[PDB]
């Protein structure tokens, strides 16, 4: 259950399990998703981290984790490589 840091995106740690396969190809999508998620989650409600997994086919799982007082905002989201609804999937 140890994570490696793919990237810090505007204060949000984008993490993946230590030995998870490579995800670099998803980074532009992940960055857009984090950008859009920040639009509805600011200040104390900003997520601490997002765990990225999957992505070996056309689907990536992003788990946004908040501080404990804001853990009711934690979400698992699924994004596709081809589809382009990041503005509405990532709120």
Author numbering: 200 to 290
Sentences copied from the publication:
While over-expression of ToxR can lead to ToxR regulon transcription, under physiological conditions ToxR requires ToxS, an integral membrane protein with a periplasmic domain, for full activity. In wild type ToxR, these cysteines are known to form either an intra-chain disulfide bond or a disulfide linked homodimer, which is present when toxS is deleted in V. cholerae. The disulfide bonded ToxR periplasmic domain consists of 5 β-strands and 2 α-helices forming an α/β fold.
The dbToxRp from V. vulnificus, which shares 55.2% identity to the V. cholerae ToxR periplasmic domain, readily crystallized. The crystal structure of V. vulnificus intra-chain disulfide ToxR periplasmic domain (Vv-dbToxRp) was solved by molecular replacement using a selenomethionine (SeMet) labeled structure to 1.25 Å (Statistics are shown in Table S1). The 5 β-strands are arranged in a β-sheet with one side packed against the two α-helices, through hydrophobic interactions. Interactions of note include a Pi-Pi stacking interaction between the Tyr236 from α1 and Tyr263 from β4 in the hydrophobic core of the protein. A sulfate ion was found in the structure, stabilized by the side chain of Arg203 and the amide nitrogens of Leu222 and Gln223. Finally, the disulfide bond between Cys232 and Cys289 covalently attaches α2 to α1 stabilizing the structure. Interestingly, the density of the α2-β5 loop (residues 281–284) was poorly defined. In addition, the α2-β5 loop has the highest B-factors in the structure. Interestingly, MatchMaker35 aligned the VtrA periplasmic domain to dbToxRp with the lowest all atom RMSD of 5.5 Å, suggesting despite the placement of VtrA in the DALI search the VtrA and ToxR periplasmic domains are structural homologs.
